Write a protein that binds this ligand. Structure first.
Ligand SMILES: Nc1ncnc2c1ncn2[C@H]1C[C@H](O)[C@@H](COP(=O)(O)OP(=O)(O)OP(=O)(O)O)O1
Ligand SMILES: Nc1ncnc2c1ncn2[C@H]1C[C@H](O)[C@@H](COP(=O)(O)OP(=O)(O)OP(=O)(O)O)O1
Ligand SMILES: [Mg+2]
Ligand SMILES: [Mg+2]
Lengths: 860, 868
């Protein structure tokens, strides 16, 4: 039975929340539509995403039916389909955010009782309402495929023919294939597919491209561990040798580059992992490195070709007295030009080719040159630029870290040593590759120390963002909650955080039941383990609304405390669903292992530094000391004391509870100041609206931040004008008096007018873009405003590399799947410091990570 | 059906008068050796090497065998399996060996044909089956004919040795029930088909779609087969999807299957994947298809130049820091190192991206004073050529007669969309023709296939138009069908100065039966191919060594007589083969798809027939009239009579019972089976040199005269006293006796002994070199008349001094004489001199269309970087 904490039955889901109307549009130097209706306090980057990312533009009719069901209530009856109107208006597109809200949360609760997740009809609406309130309050949101593909058959009756998509009955447990692609929604965007050492059969190499391409066609991402593939030189039973791992990786990389995510600008999300003991590991590590060099040589050689080949055209037309010019015997400078196209390594074929054109009386040569733009032809020529490539490393390899031991790259066919190598020498290649370009790293022993069901195999791979780590051929449904939107007044709504987690743990399962999967194996494996992926975001957005730095043990404490609460309330919620409907079919097989993941969790939640069973690196305990504790750190010990006790009685409905996803698109309709576990990137940003947009404003985070500290209202406006500027040169900048000030704060003049970069005008008319060296503010209270990058042109302080990592390790001891992250390092970063970030990550109990040095790639 | 004997007697068997002897085959680097090779005495060392290293079953052949008695099966046709009881009397190493004699190959080849043909009811009596068994093996031993390599690899392994294995994804149709089945075994049903034409639909991930095609293609590449597909059904780039968004275009998905083909070795060997990609001239992306390989060759060259420049210019940066005095960061800055500022200057003058100059600077700061920047070259197998795309495909363009008309009329050309059929973009037809000319002139691609000439001879239009071909463009039929090939060595039918037409008709009939039995015995790599191959049963009988036959008859390749002979021999082959098909349809019925295409095929047969009677008119529904059989110029008037009689009988029997097979003849390249047959020339090709290298058993070669040169000059009438002087002019006297430029001396009398005997190697280290090692040509030779000189023209000039060769026109007109009597097409790639222009390449494509040719391809010498 579910409660009611944010709504009343009399007011419904929208009592206390207003409503407005805005207009979304595009145009180049013509997609439009204006009726789009959006709730209160909603931004337009929120409103505009929903208008063409999540709205349906056609296919719903004007007014349509209910259907008689008898199981459960009237308000959750499906809708199904024109002589009222002409050919038009039988053809309408969505227009209000409540239309999608009611079809998302309605289809949630509709299927929800079909499975019997409710006790009474009173719970159905008390859940149908309570969840729409969090959608309108931007409190939480599921993954984007749910924002559109859920509830079109429930609320509108949209349907069509289908194939390839297979599901299972929620009541019988039988494998079925779909006759419709809409009546069974598709809530999953992550997939961890498998691949075998085989070409043409199912589950093989060429089959995987067929499996990935139907994923890419729908918009989902996929990740695969390819180390099952035998290396280059491994023999064939009745033939010769294999081409190698990289040769087949380039087939899939080329296929990902040609298949768009549903046809739009979005690239294909694809992850390519390889074990450290693979014979072709050095080719895998240096894949992006040498392909990046091919891009560099393509632009250098093409320009050198275009120049020299025209200088050879020079000597034949500089000749006046004939065309004896083709001969490299008697011409003004053709003997100089042929040795000028040599000299620069131009192949002899294209030099004779150019004078072969001249003998036909030809004017030109069409030799295109290439650049370093990322959508160029050069990058499309090379491989790798469509895959995220990580490396699976065992703790044994990083125990040859210290002993300077020898590493065995073992063959796949006959499990025999193919080549020996110093481990640090191989570790040296990993540091250089990521320093210049990739690969990411995933610690195989750390991720499997928290694997809930190892009897069904080891954790071998991840999704394109390394956030979801379960068995192969498993999907996952996602949802993240905007953290700061429970924060009104000075306390934080723990009353609502656990109600949000408990309620959102349930809706995620209901689409493990509601779903229709792109393959039959993934369909059953999903039903068998009912994996979940609940996360949070915007924690960096509140951590200074809090009033305390991102790089602060007082902040990692709060992070690990609410990360413990969410995952604890989620596991305890899943144990409550296992007593009413039964644990997931794969639990009893692994009841001994899954329960050990949970006791290791709350041992890390009780702050204990010891007592861990089966972990390779003991997780970072939760800081009992430095947490602000608005009745919180004890609440984290409360849920896992209850999740362990409840799970011991009924098991668990889900094998995994939580993740941390890069809530990029989904964090925009939520008005999340920061995304995922990240901090904010600036104290100054912009924002669009109807007619024209991107009038610059001040990050509303630090007005409320300094309000938390001892400060008067006019006594922080203080610094906003110091940071956003005055929008005029009207009174005492260095470019006032004399040489029309309706630039209206764009923050350029269309100088050569003698101005020794005295752009304190920019510091004046447009603000310092930073609070470093600001009026009034106490020195000890500015580290609480450090961002991801140095704020502004003259800002110099930022959150260091360990600030990002230590924040991660504090949360990962209380999350099922890894935290997705790529930390920017300064251009100064050396190869030693790059491995230092990886080596620090494993010692801190992190499962996966990714680096990027500033200015390292030609894609700048 | 009755099978007669012409080459054997029942008492003599298959090898009566055929002597067998044993040789040695060996391979190594500056590895594998077979000390056991038994071959017919006439076989060369090269043919033995091909047999031993490619066709012999190298392992798994049991040393003791035992027959499996079957009911109704003659005893000599019984299967055999390992004799497990008698194998245990041997050391474990001797129980399963490899094949050792050509007889084993011959026996298991014809044994399986006779065995399966018997169960299929193809033989009237046991005597006919034994005659077939005997005549088949005799021809194989006598190098008169050969099936395509997959038959040499695979046919008879299960029938002769019981060799078996598991099988997935392969299918066949039961000859008795007609129901589709799945193979339990990988060897019981042989896989004799080498070429496949495959369809693809405008779909990404459904069966028959794009990604599924790569799976199908990969399945063929693993076994060693080649693929051909017309991709014109794929959406143009920018065509909207009804689910929202555009398609990324045809070239993007072509890049996928091209990258897959480069990563899959055909047959697992060092061989490359045989892949044919075809686009229609009205496709919206036709411009990117035409200039595809043109741009990729530039990308290769840019990689060669850009990498070496990146190497050279970035090493100098290190040398500027290493020879700096010793502050090593007042060394990394160019403000304190004058030589370093010169290096960065020379690096940016080379257009090297500065994002890469900051890296090597930051790299030197940490202590490393070295870097590996790999540099690429123009070799075909190196990393540069596999980085780019297209290299794993033969790109052909499919041209309509209306387009060629629009080029003549300077009309404009619409590029039709695939979804709605509306005009994507209008282009001038002539400038589109100029790109095809410029592309093929620069990087050999694209080739061309004439859609209307191909479908003018399509015998089964009710089941669709011929849309594509096989990798070498000889097989042309419906999509999702295969074809088994076999070629006859024409020269073997020439002895005592006359062409044994009676035996040629005999070999055609028996090999037509053989190829049809191969359809019945086969298993196929997909259900649709298995069903369609069962329903139409296309055969690919062909020939080789017509150029070697022409030279042996004293006829030039570029002559009316040589073209009239090939047309007659091609008319007899296809005529007898079609008449044999019609007779087989008399006893067992026409193929399932014939009844609805009868009026269509019989029309094709009539045009073949009227082409045989010499009529320059009398063709039904044909866009470009074929080259009718030259009646007055053929050197043997009896062959012109036999051609007319064969097509009269082929149509008469077709009118009665139809035909067992929808296609029947083809001209394959015969590259490997030509070596095993010891054909002087392959397919329709002429010869290439007047002196050749003979391979010795242990290793090394030594040059000899083209064996057809003495036979030619005899036919023309040159006396034996003149023959030896003409040959020694070409091959040389081997060793410095008779020279008039530098010979005997004034010196060594001791080291002279075998200074001189060491002069046959023919490296020679003025015109004294031409004396001992020969001119290697016949122009300017003693005794030889000037009107007989063209008889020795070859595709390439011979020797360093030789200057005449066969014209491009000679090649094309020889094709046109044969194409009129070929079911499919003729695999040909014409090599043109480096001096050729873009207009001359288009003229070659234009001349081929006007002469009834179905497809062609050109390679200008020196055009590709791949050519050393
Ligand atoms: N023709 C080929 N060229 C190159 N690599 C190939 C080829 N065929 C297969 N491979 C590679 C792909 C895989 O890495 C590996 C196994 O492929 P496949 O032969 O289908 O497996 P298999 O399970 O049948 O084993 P085996 O080949 O030993 O019988 O060999
Ligand atoms: N996501 C994609 N990105 C790029 N091209 C795509 C994508 N999906 C399909 N295509 C291309 C592949 C083909 O060229 C063409 C049709 O493929 P597909 O959409 O699967 O066909 P379909 O038969 O389902 O038709 P339709 O898209 O009209 O419903 O579009
Ligand atoms: Mg295999
Ligand atoms: Mg589609």
């Amino acid at each position: 039975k579910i409660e009611r904490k944010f709504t009343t039955a009399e007011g419904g889901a929208y009592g206390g929340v207003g409503f407005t109307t805005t207009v979304s549009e595009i145009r180049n130097p013509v997609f439009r539509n204006e009726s789009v209706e959006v709730p209160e306090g909603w931004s337009q980057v929120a409103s505009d995403v929903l208008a063409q990312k999540y709205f349906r533009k056609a296919g719903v009719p004007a007014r349509l039916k209910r259907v008689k069901e008898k199981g459960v209530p009237d308000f959750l009856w499906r809708s199904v389909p024109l002589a009222k109107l002409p050919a038009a208006a039988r053809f309408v597109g969505e227009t209000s955010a409540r239309q999608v809200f009611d079809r998302l949360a309605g289809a949630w609760a509709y299927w929800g009782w079909k499975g019997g997740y409710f006790s009474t009809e009173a719970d159905a609406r008390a859940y149908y309402d309570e969840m729409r309130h969090m959608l309108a309050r931007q409190m939480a949101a599921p993954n984007s495929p749910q924002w559109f593909n859920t509830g079109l058959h429930w609320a509108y009756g949209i349907d069509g023919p289908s194939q390839g998509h297979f599901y299972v009955d929620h009541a019988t447990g039988k494998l079925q294939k779909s006759d419709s692609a809409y009546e069974h929604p598709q809530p999953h965007a992550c997939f961890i597919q498998s691949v075998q050492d085989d070409l043409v059969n199912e589950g093989g190499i060429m089959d995987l491209w067929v499996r990935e391409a139907r994923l890419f066609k729908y918009g989902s991402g996929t990740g695969t561990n390819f180390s099952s593939l035998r290396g280059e030189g491994e023999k064939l039973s009745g033939g010769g040798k294999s081409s190698g791992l990289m040769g087949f990786l380039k087939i899939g990389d080329r296929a990902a580059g040609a298949i768009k995510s549903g046809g739009t600008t979005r690239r294909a999300a694809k992850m390519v992992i390889c074990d450290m003991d693979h014979p072709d590991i050095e080719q895998f590590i240096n894949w992006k490195v040498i392909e990046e060099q091919k891009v560099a040589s393509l632009v250098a050689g093409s320009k050198q070709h275009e120049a020299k080949l025209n200088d050879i055209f020079a000597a034949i037309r500089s000749f006046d007295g004939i065309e004896g010019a083709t001969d490299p015997a008697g011409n003004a400078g053709l003997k100089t030009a042929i040795r000028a196209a040599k000299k620069a390594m131009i192949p002899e074929t294209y030099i004779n080719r150019v004078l072969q054109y001249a003998r036909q009386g030809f004017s030109s040569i069409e030799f295109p040159t290439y650049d370093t733009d990322w959508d160029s032809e050069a990058y499309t020529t090379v491989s790798g630029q469509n895959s995220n490539n990580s490396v699976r490393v065992t703790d044994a390899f990083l125990q040859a870290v210290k002993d300077d031991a020898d590493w065995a790259l073992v063959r796949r066919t006959d499990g025999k040593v193919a080549k020996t190598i110093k481990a640090r020498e191989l570790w040296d290649q990993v540091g250089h590759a990521a320093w210049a370009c990739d690969p990411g790293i995933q610690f195989h022993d750390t991720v499997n120390a928290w694997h809930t069901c190892p009897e069904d195999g080891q954790i071998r791979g991840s999704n394109p963002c390394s956030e979801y780590m379960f068995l192969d051929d498993t999907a996952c449904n996602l949802a993240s909650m905007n953290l700061l939107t429970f924060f009104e007044a000075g306390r934080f709504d723990a009353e609502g955080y656990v109600h949000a987690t408990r309620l959102w743990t349930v809706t995620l399962e209901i689409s493990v039941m509601m779903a229709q999967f792109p393959s039959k194996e993934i369909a059953q494996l999903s039903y068998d383990f009912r994996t979940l992926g609940l996360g949070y975001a915007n924690i960096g957005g509140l951590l200074m609304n809090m009033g305390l730095g991102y790089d602060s043990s007082e902040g990692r404490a709060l992070c690990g405390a609410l990360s413990a609460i969410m995952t604890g309330v989620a596991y305890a919620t899943s144990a409550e669903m296992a007593g009413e409907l039964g644990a997931f079919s794969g639990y009893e097989r692994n009841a001994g292992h899954m329960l050990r993941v949970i006791r290791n969790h709350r041992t890390a939640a009780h702050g204990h530094t010891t007592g861990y069973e089966g972990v390779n690196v003991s997780p970072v305990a939760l800081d009992q000391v430095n947490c602000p504790d608005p009745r919180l750190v004890a609440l984290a010990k409360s849920s896992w004391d209850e999740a362990l006790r409840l799970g011991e009685a009924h098991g668990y409905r889900n094998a995994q509870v939580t993740v941390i996803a890069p809530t990029g698109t989904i964090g925009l309709v939520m008005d999340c100041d920061t995304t995922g576990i990240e901090p904010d990137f600036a104290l100054v940003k912009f924002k669009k609206l109807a007619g024209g947009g991107y009038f610059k404003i001040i990050n509303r985070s630090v007005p409320a931040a300094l309000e938390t500290l001892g400060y008067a209202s006019a006594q922080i406006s203080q610094i906003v004008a110091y940071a956003v500027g005055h929008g005029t040169l009207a009174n005492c900048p260095t470019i006032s008096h004399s040489a029309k000030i309706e630039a209206a704060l764009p923050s350029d003049i269309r100088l050569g007018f003698t101005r020794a970069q005295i752009e304190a005008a920019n510091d004046h008319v447009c603000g310092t873009m930073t609070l470093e060296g600001a009026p009034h503010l106490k020195a000890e209270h500015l580290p609480v405003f450090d961002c991801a990058n140095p704020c502004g042109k003259k800002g110099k302080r930022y959150l260091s590399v360990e600030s990002h990592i230590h924040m991660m390790a504090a949360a990962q001891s209380f999350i099922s799947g890894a935290i997705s992250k790529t930390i920017n390092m300064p251009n100064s970063a050396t190869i030693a410091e790059t491995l230092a970030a990886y080596e620090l990550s494993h010692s801190l109990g992190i499962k996966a990570n990714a680096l990027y040095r500033d200015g390292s790639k030609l894609s700048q």
